[PDB]
């Protein structure tokens, strides 16, 4: 959904795990839309 | 496992799931076994799927 924006660190182990999961690939379409350089930026974003 | 299958929950682990050794279960193999790489890849594929 547009309001529920969820993300993770781009180009990492979790990205590989989600891409491999064919059943969960419908979420991966959202996952590629929003991603962050590092964990610090992501935690700052969730904090803000 | 025993606490989960215990009836009445009269037994419990301290610390709500406290672990000290934090080691794991592995499939033992003979030294230099040719099956080690394949078995490791199989376990990793299983845990990744």
UniProtKB/Swiss-Prot annotation, chain A:
Detected throughout the brain, in brain cortex, cerebellum, thalamus and olfactory bulb. Glycine binds at residue 13. It is found in: Cell membrane; Postsynaptic cell membrane; Synaptic cell membrane; Postsynaptic density membrane. Heterotetramer; the NMDAR subunits are modular and harbor tiered domains that function in concert to regulate opening and closing of the cation-selective ion channel pore. Forms heterotetrameric channels composed of two GluN1/zeta subunits (GRIN1), and two identical GluN2/epsilon subunits (GRIN2A, GRIN2B, GRIN2C or GRIN2D) or GluN3 subunits (GRIN3A or GRIN3B) (in vitro). Can also form heterotetrameric channels that contain at least two GluN1 subunits and at least two different GluN2 subunits (or a combination of one GluN2 and one GluN3 subunits) (in vitro). A hydrophobic region that gives rise to the prediction of a transmembrane span does not cross the membrane, but is part of a discontinuously helical region that dips into the membrane and is probably part of the pore and of the selectivity filter. The extracellular N-terminal domain (ATD) is a site of allosteric regulation to modulate overall receptor function. Component of N-methyl-D-aspartate (NMDA) receptors (NMDARs) that function as heterotetrameric, ligand-gated cation channels with high calcium permeability and voltage-dependent block by Mg(2+). NMDARs participate in synaptic plasticity for learning and memory formation by contributing to the long-term potentiation (LTP). Channel activation requires binding of the neurotransmitter L-glutamate to the GluN2 subunit, glycine or D-serine binding to the GluN1 subunit, plus membrane depolarization to eliminate channel inhibition by Mg(2+). This is Glutamate receptor ionotropic, NMDA 1. It comes from Rattus norvegicus. The chain holds residues 676 to 723 of 938 of the full protein.
UniProtKB/Swiss-Prot annotation, chain B:
It comes from the Eukaryota. It is found in: Cell projection, Dendritic spine; Cell membrane; Synapse; Postsynaptic cell membrane. Detected in brain cortex, olfactory bulb, hippocampus including the dentate gyrus, striatum, thalamus, superior colliculus, inferior colliculus, midbrain and cerebellum (at protein level). Detected in brain cortex, hypothalamus and cerebellum. Heterotetramer. Forms heterotetrameric channels composed of two GluN1/zeta subunits (GRIN1), and two identical GluN2/epsilon subunits (GRIN2A, GRIN2B, GRIN2C or GRIN2D) or GluN3 subunits (GRIN3A or GRIN3B) (in vitro). Can also form heterotetrameric channels that contain at least two GluN1 subunits and at least two different GluN2 subunits (or a combination of one GluN2 and one GluN3 subunits) (in vitro). In vivo, the subunit composition may depend on the expression levels of the different subunits. Found in a complex with GRIN1, GRIN3A and PPP2CB. Found in a complex with GRIN1 and GRIN3B. Belongs to the glutamate-gated ion channel (TC 1.A.10.1) family. NR2A/GRIN2A subfamily. Component of N-methyl-D-aspartate (NMDA) receptors (NMDARs) that function as heterotetrameric, ligand-gated cation channels with high calcium permeability and voltage-dependent block by Mg(2+). NMDARs participate in synaptic plasticity for learning and memory formation by contributing to the slow phase of excitatory postsynaptic current, long-term synaptic potentiation, and learning. Contains an N-terminal domain, a ligand-binding domain and a transmembrane domain. Agonist binding to the extracellular ligand-binding domains triggers channel gating. A hydrophobic region that gives rise to the prediction of a transmembrane span does not cross the membrane, but is part of a discontinuously helical region that dips into the membrane and is probably part of the pore and of the selectivity filter. This is Glutamate receptor ionotropic, NMDA 2A. It comes from Rattus norvegicus. The chain holds residues 737 to 785 of 1464 of the full protein.
């Amino acid at each position: 959904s547009d309001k529920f924006i969820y993300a993770t660190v781009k180009q990492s182990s979790v990205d590989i795990y989600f891409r491999r999961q064919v059943e969960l690939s419908t979420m991966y379409r959202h996952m590629e839309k929003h991603n962050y350089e590092s964990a610090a930026e992501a935690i700052q974003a969730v904090r803000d | 496992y025993k606490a989960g299958r215990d009836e009445g929950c009269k037994l419990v682990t301290i610390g709500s799931g406290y672990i000290f050794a934090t080691t794991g279960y592995g499939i033992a193999l003979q030294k230099g076994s040719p099956w080690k790489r394949q078995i490791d890849l199989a376990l990793l594929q299983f845990v990744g799927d």
